């Protein structure tokens, strides 16, 4: 921790070396002059502009906006628009030909991310409308249109491998390269909206994005079903899972500025019926993998293996797992087609549970679905769709935080977060329970109302430090 902020200040010091000397503007000017250009010129600018920011340096984020408003340069945004019209798709046509370009584009939007991360709600609104200038250029609309043509291509790459299903290295290296396209650009569309300026939320609500996000689900379903099939396809799967993570990060962030039966919540329920089909996979696909960790180490696989090391045969798996009466036989085949079928028929519990990675994603999905319910209930469109995902939320109700805060909209909203297994477990037992009972009495006995919520964290910071102790013990 303490090593990092001093390093963060080293970061910020090397950034300070620059932008105090007007380096901030040189980025902002060069791009503005390079109107439609995606020359190497522009590629060098952005990797500088990223390096100026890198971490949400607000001074720059201030100074970047200063040059835009003072010298009202409508050309800048006009230039950025033309970028995104160009940047890249993946491709499919030349991929046929390469059987016998993104680095600019990734870092384009990482630049744009860092323009906003730190939640500059002034700047995030500035990218909407560009108030002082003459012609408005909505970046946020256009980055959706970039993500839209991202989507269709990501879609198009699946269908080429919808049949072969042992995806080439040229397929992997081309597509994992495309994974980092979208993963980054979703993160913009977080950090455009993540600062909950609802102007930016409504602007994007009526935009096409939903049709992308629908279609990514069509990707993410049908990929994962066949990315599972190999022990070589996992590396791209780890990326595609990780994109699926950051994709749902996005519309969680879209849902945070929500009244209970709010329209932005309506849209999110609207898509889940239009794309009900494919989610049926990924909900089961998690139940394929969440029930898995809860059985293969439960009671009669750690006692049923004669080894103790973690080695069990295929037939030993299929006769025991199917007898547990959790899921059906077509998925036992699916998992055994997924597993390894290793050395003859055997399989390790390690690597087979390593494809545990899905619990990160499906948390957020379960968060999503819970937040849709707890914001927008009493819609059987959702209820039926939710009750299928029951098995998922059953895994995460231990692990999902749920609080209330009054998060600046003067209504109290509800916030979800990740409860760790280590921190949950440490909380209950040792002395912390003896420390809380000690706390709860001290509050009600002598607490003023200002002092009560102030004494709260005064416990909690200790109680952070409790588990920092009691777990290292």
């Amino acid at each position: 921790f303490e090593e990092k902020e001093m390093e963060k200040q080293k970061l910020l010091y090397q950034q300070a070396r620059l932008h105090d000397r007007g380096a901030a503007e040189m980025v902002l000017q060069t791009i503005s002059a390079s109107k439609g250009e995606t020359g190497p010129m522009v590629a060098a600018t952005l990797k500088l502009g990223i390096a100026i920011l890198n971490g949400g340096n607000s001074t720059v984020q201030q100074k970047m906006l200063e040059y835009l408003k003072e010298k009202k340069d409508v050309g800048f945004f006009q230039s950025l628009a033309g970028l995104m019209q160009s940047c890249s798709v993946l491709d499919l046509n030349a991929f046929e030909r390469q059987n016998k370009d993104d680095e600019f584009t990734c870092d384009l939007f990482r630049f744009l991310q860092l323009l906003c991360e730190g939640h500059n709600s002034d700047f995030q609104n500035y990218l909407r409308t560009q108030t002082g200038n003459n012609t408005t250029v909505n970046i946020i609309i256009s980055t959706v249109d970039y993500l839209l043509r991202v989507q269709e291509s990501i879609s198009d790459f699946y269908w080429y491998y919808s049949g072969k299903d042992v995806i080439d290295e040229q397929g992997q290296r081309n597509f994992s390269k495309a994974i980092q396209v979208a993963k980054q650009v979703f993160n913009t569309l977080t950090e455009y909206i993540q600062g909950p300026c609802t102007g930016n939320q409504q602007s994007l609500a009526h935009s096409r994005l939903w049709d992308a996000v629908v279609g990514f689900l069509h990707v993410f379903a049908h990929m994962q079903m066949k990315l599972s099939q190999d022990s070589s396809q996992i590396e791209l799967l780890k990326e595609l899972m990780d994109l699926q993570k950051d994709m749902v990060v996005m519309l969680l962030s879209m849902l945070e500025g929500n009244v209970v039966n709010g329209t932005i919540g309506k849209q999110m329920v609207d898509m889940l019926v239009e794309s009900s089909n494919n989610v049926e996979m990924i909900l089961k696909f998690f139940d394929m993998f969440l029930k898995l960790k809860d059985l293969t180490s439960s009671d009669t696989f750690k006692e049923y293996d004669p080894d103790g090391k973690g080695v069990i045969s295929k037939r030993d798996f299929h006769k025991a797992m199917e007898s547990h009466k959790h899921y059906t036989q077509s998925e036992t085949e699916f998992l055994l087609s997924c597993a390894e079928t290793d050395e003859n028929e055997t399989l390790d519990y390690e690597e087979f549970v390593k494809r545990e990675p899905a619990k990160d994603i499906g948390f957020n999905v379960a968060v999503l679905l819970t937040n849709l319910s707890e914001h927008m209930p009493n819609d059987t469109r959702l209820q039926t769709f939710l009750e299928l995902a029951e098995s998922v939320l059953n895994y995460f109700q231990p692990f999902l935080g749920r609080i209330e805060i009054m998060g600046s909209a003067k209504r109290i909203e509800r916030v979800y977060f990740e409860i760790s297994e280590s921190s949950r477990t440490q909380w209950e037992k040792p002395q912390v329970k003896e420390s809380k009972r000690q706390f709860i009495f001290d509050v009600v006995n002598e607490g003023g109302e200002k002092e009560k919520m102030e004494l709260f964290v005064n416990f909690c910071e200790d109680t952070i430090f409790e588990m920092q102790l009691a777990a290292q013990i």
Partner: protein, 422 residues
Amino acid sequence: AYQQKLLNYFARNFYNMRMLALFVAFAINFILLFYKVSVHYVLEESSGYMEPTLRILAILHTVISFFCIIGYYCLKVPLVIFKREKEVARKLEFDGLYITEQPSEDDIKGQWDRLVINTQSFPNNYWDKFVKRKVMDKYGEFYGRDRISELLGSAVLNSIDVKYQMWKLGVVFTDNSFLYLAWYMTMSVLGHYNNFFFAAHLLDIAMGFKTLRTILSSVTHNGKQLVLTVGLLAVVVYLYTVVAFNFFRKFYNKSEDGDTPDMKCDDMLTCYMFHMYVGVRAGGGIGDEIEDPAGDEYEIYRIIFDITFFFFVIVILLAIIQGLIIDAFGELRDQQEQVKEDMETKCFICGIGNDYFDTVPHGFETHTLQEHNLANYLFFLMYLINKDETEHTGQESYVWKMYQERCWEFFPAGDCFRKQYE
């Protein structure tokens, strides 16, 4: 490496180690019950090996009490430090007490901290070593830059910060919880020396159980009132004893008939310490333990001396003093009682109450296990610290900005989610 890792065993096992100390000493009660005289002596009926088990247990129990405190020294002690280094450092920022405010001669707990700030290590266990820099960058433009930087700043024998460690153990000593166990160790030490004082350990039954710490707390609850009250009884009794001295000295005869070397109570020290032994504690007063008045001019005057001593002293002043403990006990349990009510009546955070959430069946339990459920606000606040500020959500980053500011309006006042809506 064997020292640290074994020390990790003690902190895990402290509460069983401390409960076992009560289990052991309870047998030391059972065995000290078997003494007699001859010079001191131990009779062992029904067994011959039980006195060497006292030789076992005395060594056993003491060094257990040594292994508990050295397990306690890393169990809660650093948290105590954590609390104390927290207390200072927020007040260095927000108050600037050693910059500006200079705390009073009372609360040496404040003034104990003057030493530690010059040390290099100062916020060891606070996870925030940047505080010492941040105070320089807040106040050093105003008052002194390198004046405040002057204020702030084999291999084992020269590695440690001495000025820190002197401060630290000072704060360790001022802990009630440590110093109890410290005082518990010293009673164990003297048991290895003399086995008599060894069973005074049984007052772990007081601070052990929660209902018996309260009763001795009930003694010092209202203690500020008590001592002034007992002082009253001191005085009142001294007033009677002077009247007795001047008017009624003859009535005091401890002896038989006067034909014996007639012991009488007229010296003022002895006469005053008569009534605190006799007159306070008689329960019937002086007029139980004295010559009944039988035919004097001062016969009547003795009675009027007496009943007055009995209504004022025995009936009023004892029983008040008696009461003022009981009343404190009655208060104190009632303060315990209300807390248990308060957790069930109102929500701890949003404060609303039981009634609003009984509209939904089984609803107040949901408001206590889903909506607010205290540990989550703990865990959320971990979650803020566990992630980076880049990755924070707009809700989170708000809160984090609330938090670093310490402005606290993020909690639900009363307008929790159910109340906010329909």
